[PDB]
């Protein structure tokens, strides 16, 4: 397993935070 | 928009932090 | 827990329709 | 597009609610 | 379940890959 | 961006496919 799945969601969480980030950038420009 | 888009993906990402957190807890228990 | 997991993904699916709605408007305007 | 994109996130929202409902099943029995 | 979960996540992964595809197409367009 | 968003979703698809594959292992065992 379950630790692998947990870290999979943690990595997906970083990826979605970065997606929100880059969407803030594209929202401005 | 796109600012609402960014903030809602931010919320979704924080929900994956919660998800990961939950799987760590159930991983041993 | 097991209830909590289904608890967040209910709201998560709740949000994806908001994403749909938003890009629905962006596609038009 | 963007119409397909918004349509696809609507489908994703439909998938996730079933996913949650599915963990609801395992939460009981 | 758990088979439904596995196939469901595989399907949503395929859908996200498809969306990545249209965003790659629209990046140049 | 748009390319970064597409590659983010491509990574999302890869991790979700891995998760889907993984849950099948728990399903058998």
Q: Is the Cβ–Cβ distance between D26 and E5 less than 8 Å?
A: no
Q: Is the Cβ–Cβ distance between F11 and A15 less than 8 Å?
A: yes
Q: Is the Cβ–Cβ distance between D22 and E5 less than 8 Å?
A: yes
Q: Which of A11, A18, A22 sits opposite F15 (nearest CB)?
A: A11
Q: Which of chain D's residues have a Cβ under 8 Å away from the Cβ of C4?
A: none
CA angle D12, F20, E23 (to 5 degrees): 45
CA end-to-end span of chain D: 44
Q: Which two tokens stand for residue C10?
A: 């209910």
Q: Is C9 exposed, middle or buried (0-12, 13-18, 19+ CB in 10 A)?
A: buried
CA pair distance E20, F15, nearest whole angstrom: 14
Expressed in Å, this structure's resolution amounts to 3.9
Chain D meets chain C (3+ C-beta pairs below 8 A) = yes
Helix (H) or strand (E) holding A15: helix A3-28
CA pair distance A7, A27, nearest whole angstrom: 30
Instruction: Write the CA distances from F10 to B28, C6, D21, F4, F6, integer angstroms.
Output: 31, 25, 27, 10, 6
Any A CB within 8 A of B18 CB:
no
């Amino acid at each position: 397993x379950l630790k692998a799945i947990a870290q999979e969601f943690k990595a997906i969480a970083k990826k979605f935070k970065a997606i929100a980030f880059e969407f803030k950038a594209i929202a401005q420009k």
